[PDB]
């Protein structure tokens, strides 16, 4: 190819552009499901004070 | 949307948290024993 | 509570009791001060993240050619600088009964006095650099150029001062003066002893002190721009930008806990426990001066300038020094301290060993001279951080 700021040819690699052309934010495609208590599904609920 | 199995048990919790304080309002109309009603000069 | 404690307001020696003879005015109250910088610099919209100012820097170019002589290639180039805010904040505290009575409107009085103190801190942090935060870039007093004005203000501002300003390719757009400048604009006579700046029966106020113009530039007046020898400025005030992320917040509590001591020797007071009330005050400011050499500092006659030279520990080659664009020989990066004084007086100008002084050692010299001083690091092999700067008053 050419070096990072090759003096004849402008490229997206060139330091002069840094802050333009950033990668865009995306949602977390790999998030866990938020897990929840198993004992609350099997043990009898009772009122308490 | 929420699964009505979970919503049921969420709502019995909220309901019972109310019952514990409604006890106070019942105690005046039913005229039940209240700790603050007892006249102190009477021997135990 | 301890009566007349240094932090807490409470019913103590500061209050007469509000008897009928108490006059509705302090008939000798001076009117409240206000920021200068906030009425002369560009106000820029700004948020908590700070902002980036881009700039162009390419030597874009084209060449003459012959018939059929195949054509050259060229470049643009670009750069940026970021700017950030800094908080200024304070707390004041009073007994709940003092908040209830509000004696002499002390709480309202405080809420204006803190706002003025904050406005004045922003002026002095930008003008003189006194206690300036890390986030601000440059302050006016940091300029490498000075002009004295006191024998004749016209020859001062319009001629001598302007010469040293336009010669750098900088330009004059405004002038900003302290009210102590009045008695050097008054007088400033022609040779027949008539004043300049005022009309033929001397009843009128002096033209610049009307906020009138000088040679087409407007005059800004202040009661507080002076410090040390400096009584005013002239320059390109478009080179200053400033921002404010939010107005002065006021937030109030009886419920919180303060420390009356320093951080490492704390004395925690619960406001609720003593039934005190506290008010938090804060604001965020940002400032940038594009460069500080766009302004000439204005003084009375005999002014002398101190510079600090800093090679960033560079280890082989030479620097060189210049006064008024005249240029000395090369000087070694480690040259013995009297060498710098010898190299300065070797300039083709009337500077001499009784006026010029120097202190320090290899690569940490402090230089004192009667003029505009600049330094060149092109002869220095590893001068990749090398620099020069202007020293403050103290």
From TrEMBL, chain B:
<protein>
    <submittedName>
        <fullName>Portal protein</fullName>
    </submittedName>
</protein>
Automatic annotation (TrEMBL), chain C:
<feature type="domain" description="Phage capsid-like C-terminal">
    <location>
        <begin position="24"/>
        <end position="300"/>
    </location>
</feature>
<keyword id="KW-0946">Virion</keyword>
<protein>
    <submittedName>
        <fullName>Major capsid protein</fullName>
    </submittedName>
</protein>
<dbReference type="InterPro" id="IPR054612">
    <property type="entry name" value="Phage_capsid-like_C"/>
</dbReference>
<dbReference type="InterPro" id="IPR024455">
    <property type="entry name" value="Phage_capsid"/>
</dbReference>
<dbReference type="GO" id="GO:0044423">
    <property type="term" value="C:virion component"/>
</dbReference>
<dbReference type="Pfam" id="PF05065">
    <property type="entry name" value="Phage_capsid"/>
</dbReference>
């Amino acid at each position: 190819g050419f070096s990072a700021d090759h003096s004849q040819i402008a490229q997206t690699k060139d330091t002069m552009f840094t802050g333009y052309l950033d990668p865009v934010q995306a949602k977390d495609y790999f998030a866990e499901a938020e897990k929840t208590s198993i004992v609350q599904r099997v043990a009898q609920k009772i009122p308490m004070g | 949307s929420i699964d009505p199995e979970k919503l049921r048990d969420q709502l019995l919790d909220a309901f019972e948290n109310k019952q514990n304080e409604l006890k106070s309002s019942k105690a005046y109309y039913d005229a039940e024993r209240r700790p603050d009603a007892i006249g102190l000069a009477v021997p135990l | 509570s301890a009566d007349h404690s240094q932090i807490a307001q409470t019913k103590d020696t500061m209050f007469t009791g509000y008897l009928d003879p108490v006059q509705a005015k302090d008939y000798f109250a001076e009117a409240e001060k206000t920021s200068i910088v906030q009425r002369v610099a560009q106000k820029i919209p700004m948020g908590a993240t700070g902002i980036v100012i881009p700039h162009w820097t390419g030597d874009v170019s084209a060449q003459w050619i012959g018939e059929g002589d195949m054509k050259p290639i060229t470049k643009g180039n670009m750069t940026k600088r970021d700017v950030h805010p800094a908080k200024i904040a304070t707390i004041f505290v009073a007994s709940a009964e003092t908040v209830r009575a509000n004696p002499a409107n002390y709480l309202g009085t405080m809420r204006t006095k803190v706002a003025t103190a904050i406005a004045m801190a922003f002026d002095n942090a930008a003008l003189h650099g006194t206690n300036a935060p890390s986030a601000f870039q440059g302050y006016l007093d940091q300029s490498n150029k000075t002009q004295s004005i006191s024998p004749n203000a016209y020859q001062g501002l319009g001629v001598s001062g302007l010469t040293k300003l336009v010669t750098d390719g900088k330009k004059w757009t405004h002038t900003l003066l302290d009210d102590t400048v009045e008695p050097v604009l008054n007088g400033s006579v022609d040779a027949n002893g008539r004043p300049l700046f005022v009309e033929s029966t001397y009843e009128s106020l002096t033209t610049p002190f009307r906020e009138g113009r000088i040679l087409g530039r407007p005059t800004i007046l202040s009661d507080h721009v002076a410090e040390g020898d400096v009584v005013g400025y002239a320059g390109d005030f478009s080179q200053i930008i400033w921002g404010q992320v939010g107005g002065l917040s006021f937030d109030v509590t009886d419920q919180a806990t303060l420390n009356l001591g320093s951080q490492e020797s704390p004395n925690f007071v619960s406001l609720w426990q003593h039934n005190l009330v506290a008010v938090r005050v804060e604001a965020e400011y940002g400032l940038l001066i594009n460069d500080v050499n766009a302004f000439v500092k204005l003084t009375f006659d005999p002014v002398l300038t101190t510079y600090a030279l800093d090679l960033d520990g560079a280890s082989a080659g030479n620097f060189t020094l210049s006064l008024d664009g005249k240029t000395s020989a090369n000087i070694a990066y480690n040259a013995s301290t009297a060498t710098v004084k010898s190299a300065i007086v070797a300039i083709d100008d009337g500077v001499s060993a009784d006026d010029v002084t120097v202190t320090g050692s290899a690569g940490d010299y402090t230089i004192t001279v009667p003029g505009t001083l600049t330094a060149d690091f092109s002869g220095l092999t590893d001068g990749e951080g090398a620099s020069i700067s202007v020293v403050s008053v103290g």
